[PDB]
Amino acid sequence: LNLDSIIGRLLEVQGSRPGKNVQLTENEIRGLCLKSREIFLSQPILLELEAPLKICGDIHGQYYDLLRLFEYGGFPPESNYLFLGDYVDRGKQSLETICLLLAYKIKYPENFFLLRGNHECASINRIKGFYDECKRRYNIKLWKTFTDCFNCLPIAAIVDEKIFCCHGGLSPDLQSMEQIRRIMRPTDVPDQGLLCDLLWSDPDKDVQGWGENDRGVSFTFGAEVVAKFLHKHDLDLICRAHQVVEDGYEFFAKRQLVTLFSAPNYCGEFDNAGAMMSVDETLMCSFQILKPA
Ligand SMILES: [Mn+2]
Ligand SMILES: [Mn+2]
């Protein structure tokens, strides 16, 4: 697997008209999936990470915005990175997006990290775009290969014992971090339970305790649920993604939770910015922001 050739071709379109494809070979992408899958399984499902690092929310196949994020934040390994999931679907270039991310994971496995979003799940990305991209530009066997890889992604991360990170949010079934560590891989995303909630739940300002989620999956949780979680586990901040927010980032529960969304102008019918959170050595948070067009 010629990793540097793959990364070079993926980065070659920097400065091109947004939309220009990078078409790797089928064997190259299969190798990216197989090798990254091995690395994901070799690392904990609950990552224990160190600052400084940069944290990114949803990308949803907006490959040229991913390139802008790296241009702003420093291409790996000049900065350490944690991504919070939802790499595919909706956008036009899920394939270039996920291939660059997997290539950086293989090249910099201790300095580059990917969590699982609810779209890294076959039943979701069958309908929402990624299956169609694979069928058109490669074949469905490659889509299954991607699925096998997604099923091994880690689910959450803790930065310096203080910042808890996942795609969705908290769970009424999450009482101990050991519950996350005991989750076995590979796995699909179940329709209920701890793993589902970590990828699907949402914070809600108008909810007390746990409420019903409008997505039809998982729950909503209020500010008191966040405060109790931080106190019980001696944490300072929940960092999650999953929801479009106008500024690219949005604090919640007196800045005890932050939502990150890194795909600007989402789907075309969203005038949102995309944001990336910079976490310095003392865990102080700042933002780099792709303003809407
Ligand atoms: Mn999303
Ligand atoms: Mn999501």
From Swiss-Prot:
UniProt keyword terms in alphabetical order: Acetylation, Carbohydrate metabolism, Cell cycle, Cell division, Cytoplasm, Glycogen metabolism, Host-virus interaction, Hydrolase, Manganese, Metal-binding, Nucleus, Phosphoprotein, Protein phosphatase
InterPro entries per the UniProt record, alphabetical: Calcineurin-like_PHP_ApaH, Metallo-depent_PP-like, PP1_catalytic_subunit, Ser/Thr-sp_prot-phosphatase, STPPase_N
Induction remark: Up-regulated in synovial fluid mononuclear cells and peripheral blood mononuclear cells from patients with rheumatoid arthritis.
Active-site residues, as the UniProt record annotates them: H119 (proton donor)
Keyword Cytoplasm annotated: yes
GO terms under biological process: branching morphogenesis of an epithelial tube; cell division; circadian regulation of gene expression; dephosphorylation; entrainment of circadian clock by photoperiod; glycogen metabolic process; lung development; negative regulation of transcription elongation by RNA polymerase II
Family note: Belongs to the PPP phosphatase family. PP-1 subfamily.
Name under which the protein is recorded: Serine/threonine-protein phosphatase PP1-alpha catalytic subunit
Name of the gene encoding the protein in the UniProt record: PPP1CA
